[PDB]
From a paper:
The assembly of tau into amyloid filaments is a hallmark of Alzheimer's disease (AD) and other tauopathies. Cryo‐EM revealed the existence of disease‐specific tau folds, which are challenging to replicate in vitro. We studied three full‐length recombinant 0N3R tau forms (the wild‐type and the C322A and C322S variants) using an RT‐QuIC assay with brain homogenate seeding.
C322S tau yielded structurally distinct filaments with an ordered C‐terminal region. Both mutants seeded further aggregation, whereas the wild‐type showed poor reproducibility and mainly unfolded aggregates.
Numbering used by the authors:
A (entry chain A), B (entry chain B), C (entry chain C): 316 to 434
The structure:
């Protein structure tokens, strides 16, 4: 008589890793600068989410100019100045489960900048 | 007469590691600068969330100018000054479960800056 | 009368690695600069999501100028300044399960930039 909608079900999990053998012999272990090391170890992620989830993401822009006369004998400059209705240069990194590494980096090597506005 | 909507279910979890063997032999262990090491160890994440979750995000912008005459015999400069209706240069990093490493990094190398405005 | 809709079901998980053998013999282990090492170790991700999830994304831009006369004996400049109705130069990196590495990197090498506006 079951009804299941938008759902996750796993049932039973059995782990029986007893009696495994791991050996590491060295004169030196020398681990430097962001090493990850996993020797005979277990790492385990079980994710059983319910469904029917919603993301709603709305952008609305209304831009209007009213003029009779614009820049009569003048100078009008619009520079690097967009009208967007959304994000400007967004970065998204999405993951759900990780047993390793996730890494978002921004490292410009940028010896000079200069902005001049000289009306 | 069971009804399940937007749900997670995990029945039973069993774990039996008895009699497992791990050995590391060295004259020196030398771990330096952000090292992760797991030796014969368990790292476990179980996530069973309910569903039906809602994320609602909404940006609205109404921009209007009324003018009679604009910049009559003058100079008007709009510089790096957008109308956006959203986020400006956002970073999003998302993960649900991690047994490892997560990084978001800013490291600009930037010897000089100048902004000049000179009407 | 059993009904399943938009749903994930696994069943049962049985794991039995007993009697497995791994050996590493060296004079030196020298791991440097972002190394991931997995010796006799196990990593496991089980993902059983419910379905029927929704992502709704919506951009609306209405741009209008009204004028009778525009730039009468004047200079009008629109520079690198689009009307968009969406994201500008977006980055998306999407994944679900990782036992490895994920990275998003910006590393521009750039000796100069200059911006000039001179009405």
């Amino acid at each position: 008589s079951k009804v299941t909608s938008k759902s996750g079900s796993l049932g039973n999990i059995h782990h029986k890793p007893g009696g495994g053998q791991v050996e590491v012999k060295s004169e030196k272990l020398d681990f430097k600068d962001r090493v990850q090391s996993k020797i005979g170890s277990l790492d385990n992620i079980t994710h059983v989410p319910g469904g029917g989830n919603k993301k709603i993401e709305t952008h609305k822009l209304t831009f209007r100019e009213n003029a009779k006369a614009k820049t009569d004998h003048g100078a009008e400059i619009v520079y690097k100045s967009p009208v967007v209705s959304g994000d400007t240069s967004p970065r998204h990194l999405s993951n759900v489960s990780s047993t390793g590494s996730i890494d978002m980096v921004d490292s410009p090597q940028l010896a000079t900048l200069a902005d001049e506005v000289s009306a």
